[PDB]
C-alpha cells in the first residue's frame, strides 16, 4: 500500500486521484486516504502529489507511522473519490506546515 500522510491535510489538491488505476482514494473534508486492500502499489500517484504527502508504506517517515493505520481506518468510512477537483482555498498557505493532524476533520 501507498499511504497519504500529514501534508495533504488542509491542502487536498486531489491531483493524485487522476493517475490511480484502481480508484482507491477516499475523500474526507480536508484530507484523502488510500484504501490498503485496493491499492496495487503501482506508485503512479506519488510523483503527482504537489504536497509530496504520499509514501510507500515501507517508506513512511518514523514520526508519521500513525498515518498507515489512519488511512486504513478512514478508507472504511469515507466515500470513494474518482475525479479531481479544485484544491482547498488556502492550500498553499498550509503546504509544508507541520503537525497538521490536529486539524484533521472526520
| Contacting residue, 15, 19, 52, 101, with ligand SF4 by CB under 6 A | 19
Q: Is 24 annotated as a binding residue?
A: no
Residue with cell 502529489: 49
Segment contacting ligand SF4 by CB under 6 A, of 42-50, 63-71, 72-80, 85-93: 42-50
Among 20, 51, 75, 88, binds ligand F3S (CB under 6 A): 51
If binding is defined by CB under 6 A, does position 39 make contact with ligand F3S?
A: no
- 34 binds, options ligand SF4, ligand F3S, none, Cβ within 5 to 8 A by partner type: ligand SF4
d(C-alpha 54, C-alpha 34), whole Å: 9
> Contact with ligand SF4 (CB under 6 A): which of 9, 11, 39, 60?
39
Please, which contacts does 101-105 make with residues 24 or more away whose CB atoms are closer than 8 Å? 101/6, 101/9, 101/66, 103/9, 103/10, 103/30, 104/9, 104/28, 104/30, 104/31, 105/28, 105/29, 105/30, 105/31
16 binds ligand F3S (CB under 6 A): yes
Torsion angles phi and psi, residue 42, rounded to 5? -80, -15
Which residues contact ligand F3S (rule: CB under 6 A)?
4, 8, 11-16, 32, 49, 51, 53-54
Amino acid at each position: 500500500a501507498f499511504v497519504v500522510t500529514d501534508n495533504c491535510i488542509k491542502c487536498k489538491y486531489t491531483d493524485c486521484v487522476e493517475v490511480c488505476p484502481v480508484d482507491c482514494f477516499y475523500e474526507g473534508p480536508n484530507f484523502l486516504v488510500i484504501h490498503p486492500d485496493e491499492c496495487i502499489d503501482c506508485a503512479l500517484c506519488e510523483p503527482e502529489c504537489p504536497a509530496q504527502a504520499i509514501f510507500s508504506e515501507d517508506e513512511v517517515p518514523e514520526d508519521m507511522q500513525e498515518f498507515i493505520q489512519l488511512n486504513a481506518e478512514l478508507a472504511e468510512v469515507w466515500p470513494n473519490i474518482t475525479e479531481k477537483k479544485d484544491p482547498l482555498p488556502d492550500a498553499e498557505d498550509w503546504d509544508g506546515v507541520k503537525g497538521k493532524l490536529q486539524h484533521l476533520e472526520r
